[PDB]
Design a protein around this ligand. Structure first.
Ligand SMILES: N[C@@H](CCC(=O)N[C@@H](CS)C(=O)NCC(=O)O)C(=O)O
Ligand SMILES: N[C@@H](CCC(=O)N[C@@H](CS)C(=O)NCC(=O)O)C(=O)O
Ligand SMILES: Oc1cc(O)cc(/C=C/c2ccc(O)cc2O)c1
Ligand SMILES: Oc1cc(O)cc(/C=C/c2ccc(O)cc2O)c1
Lengths: 235, 235
């Protein structure tokens, strides 16, 4: 494939989707990463890379240039789920996209549940807006799609890429009591989510497997995330 | 491919996406359609086909059975955008999915704008919730992605499938003054959208081309839609 520059940020789970995808394709050492400071974005980022002014975004092809001077001739691409499929399409030996048309649809349907159920329910609960039960129910939607063993469609896929960055950050929030509830309530909900027992037993096992995946650990600065999350809660 | 039963409804633009996709693949005469009455859904639909109780949904493979007695052995698939990619994946000579990985990402990015900008802005404006300007701005987002000529990525694609059912219904709403504004305001906004002149000139030409597409006209019961839309407004 042509040259890839990835504009990302350690804090952002949507960006980590693309870092995981690249690592699964064993291409993480072929791509140039540029870290965007989301509190002080470069003035050239929105006009020259991504008018939405968000990470992730990729610059594809074109000449060799410094990443803070992206070329007009590279193709600019945004939206994390689209970029994960692009990486899958460019590096087929990653095996991120299943060959079988039914398994592809089932992987993408799982992603739809991550998008429309897990993430909004996690955001609402972690922000103190909604109930614990609203979050757990959304998790049960995903659990019910899981096969008896393995990842979301058996073999690891784009489905697992989409979810994992949000799971790993939810763990930090809950482990550290940053979820807006009294001390100890965070850790109890974490245990429900990941113990492997109880109402979310099957999801718990799956969660253990997602967080053990090499690509996740390699793209996840737990110390940095935990520090940012404590500071944010402190306000 | 194996046998396809499509559970659909004439009124539903999300379902029409899948009918268009099948017709572009020139497979509309190979699939069994079953019309779901959304005001009186069959008691077996949610438990046996789609627990979300929405159209579209596909039953794939399994034995030959009456469509009101779907088999446990067929694979049940839902979500219109996923089903459009499934149809593309099953009938490659449809040319719905571009070969080139960049063009695929650009087609899917256009779909993201249809999903996150056009449809919500159309819903809010047609329901009397928001301003005309909020709707037109969202249309301009899509316009800015269009190439100098052709469809969303040049050759017709899944991008055009995603948008067209909503455009054709918006036309009926606006042509017939069903948008919650005084007589004549609907038709004026239609002219902005589709005249080919003015602030939305390029989109207007594109809109003419989408509504002339054979697959759209063949899957669009304009008389039925117009009758349902007048009755709904009458309440
Ligand atoms: N829908 C986008 C969302 C990405 C997104 O929200 N990124 C955040 C950080 S995690 C961002 O860059 N925010 C910057 C801003 O809103 O100014 C995707 O999936 O790529
Ligand atoms: N996200 C779904 C939405 C489909 C949808 O909303 N279908 C409507 C009709 S246009 C439906 O079946 N509604 C039935 C109900 O909500 O009870 C998709 O794209 O497939
Ligand atoms: O410093 C900044 C600036 C900014 O604009 C966004 C962010 C973080 C966004 C984010 C984090 C977690 C998540 O689940 C979803 C998110 O969008 C951090
Ligand atoms: O009789 C029924 C029952 C029901 O549950 C939904 C519908 C229509 C839904 C619909 C139409 C247009 C659109 O832009 C979006 C929509 O979801 C009609």
């Amino acid at each position: 494939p042509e040259r890839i520059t990835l504009y990302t940020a350690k804090i952002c789970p949507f960006a980590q989707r693309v870092e995981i995808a690249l690592h699964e394709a064993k291409a993480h050492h072929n791509v140039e990463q540029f870290q965007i400071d989301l509190q002080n974005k470069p003035e050239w980022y929105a006009p020259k890379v991504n008018p939405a002014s968000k990470v992730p975004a990729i610059a594809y092809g074109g000449p060799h240039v410094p990443p803070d001077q992206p070329s007009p001739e590279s193709i600019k691409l945004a939206e994390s789920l689209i970029l994960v499929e692009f990486v899958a399409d460019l590096f087929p030996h990653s095996h991120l996209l299943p060959h079988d048309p039914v398994k592809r649809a089932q992987a993408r349907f799982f992603i739809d549940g991550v998008s429309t159920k897990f993430i909004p329910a996690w955001h609402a609960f972690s922000q103190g807006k909604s109930s614990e039960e609203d979050f757990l129910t959304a998790v049960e939607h995903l659990q019910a799609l899981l096969p008896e063993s393995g990842f979301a469609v058996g073999a690891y896929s784009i489905a697992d890429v989409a979810l994992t960055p949000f799971l790993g950050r939810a763990r930090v929030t809950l482990k550290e009591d940053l979820g807006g509830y009294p001390r100890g309530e965070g850790p109890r909900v974490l245990a429900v989510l990941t113990s492997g027992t109880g109402r979310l037993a099957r999801f718990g096992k799956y969660a253990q497997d997602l967080l053990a995946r090499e690509s996740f650990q390699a793209t996840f600065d737990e110390a940095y995330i935990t520090e940012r999350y404590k500071a944010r809660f402190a306000d």
